[PDB]
Amino acid sequence: SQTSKYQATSVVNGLLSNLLPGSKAQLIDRNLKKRVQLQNRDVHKIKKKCKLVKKKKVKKHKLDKEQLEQLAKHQVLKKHQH
């Protein structure tokens, strides 16, 4: 429930700086060895994408609130000069 949701939230917050996804044992060993080759990923690029998205939402909220404060200053100067 909420415990599992907060646990997954803290896990994803910890792994946000990890950027990872989420019996034929010779095949398992070879797959785990080739996963070291596949581990040369574009995690810096996807982190730049997420950071630019966060910067975009931050600039959007800051510009909207600053325009709201400008309208507040216009209304307060209007009600003052009245």
Partner 1 sequence: KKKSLESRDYYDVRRNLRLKVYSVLDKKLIRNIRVELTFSCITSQENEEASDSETHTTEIKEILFKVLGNVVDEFVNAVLPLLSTSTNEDIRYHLTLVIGSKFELEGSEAIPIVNNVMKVLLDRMPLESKSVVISQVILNTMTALVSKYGSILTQALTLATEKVSSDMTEVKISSLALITNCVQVLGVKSIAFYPKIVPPSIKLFDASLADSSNPLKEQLQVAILLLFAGLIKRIPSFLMSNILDVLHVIYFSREVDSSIRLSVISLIIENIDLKEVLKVLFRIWSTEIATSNDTVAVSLFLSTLESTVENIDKKSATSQSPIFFKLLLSLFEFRSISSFDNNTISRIEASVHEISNSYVLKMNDKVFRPLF
In the complex, the residues that contact partner 1 under the rule CB under 8 A are 2-3, 6-11, 13-15, 17-18, 20-23, 25-26, 28-30, 32-33, 35-36, 39, 57-58, 61-62, 65, 68-69, 71-72, 75-76, 79
Cβ nearer to partner 1, comparing 28 with 49: 28
Tell me which of RNA, partner 1, none is bound by residue 5, counting a contact when its beta carbon lies within the kind-specific cut-off of 5 to 8 angstroms. Answer: none
CB 19 within 8 A of CB 47: yes
Please identify, among the stretches 11-19, 20-28, 40-48, 73-81, the one whose residues bind RNA according to the rule CB under 7 A: 20-28
